[PDB]
Amino acid sequence: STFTNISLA
Amino acid sequence: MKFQYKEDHPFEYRKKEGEKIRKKYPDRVPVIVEKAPKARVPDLDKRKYLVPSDLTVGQFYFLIRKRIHLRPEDALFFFVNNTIPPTSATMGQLYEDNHEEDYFLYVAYSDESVYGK
């Protein structure tokens, strides 16, 4: 599985 | 507390992945986000998240809530080690105090204010 990057925008 | 990420991957696998991602991104934290068992909340398509360490828990709450797409009247609570984390704390601060030996932070969500309720 691959990480998804969390951001405010 | 139970997580499907642990049922899919043994500890030795989780530790290698969490150790490498922390050395690659020292300013970010890996977080496992899954739904509480008895929670009446929609599911998430993804469970592994790379979160900026300076993002607050309250901001992480709002970003996950938008991914779950909840109705405005829907309640949502987060749990780390059977405790609702502080709102003003940063995700890096919460990670340092609560990460497991696989270098992952485990967060569960539910519509109830008690974890297993």
Numbering used by the authors:
A (entry chain B): 12 to 20
B (entry chain A): 1 to 117
Text lifted from the article:
Autophagy-related 8 (ATG8) proteins play a central role in autophagosome formation and selective delivery of cytoplasmic cargo to lysosomes by recruiting autophagy adaptors and receptors. The LC3-interacting region (LIR) docking site (LDS) of ATG8 proteins binds to LIR motifs present in autophagy adaptors and receptors. A genome wide siRNA screen identified the short coiled-coil protein (SCOC) as a novel positive regulator of starvation induced autophagy. To further understand the role of SCOC in autophagy, we identified a functional LIR motif in the unstructured region N-terminal of the coiled-coil domain of SCOC.
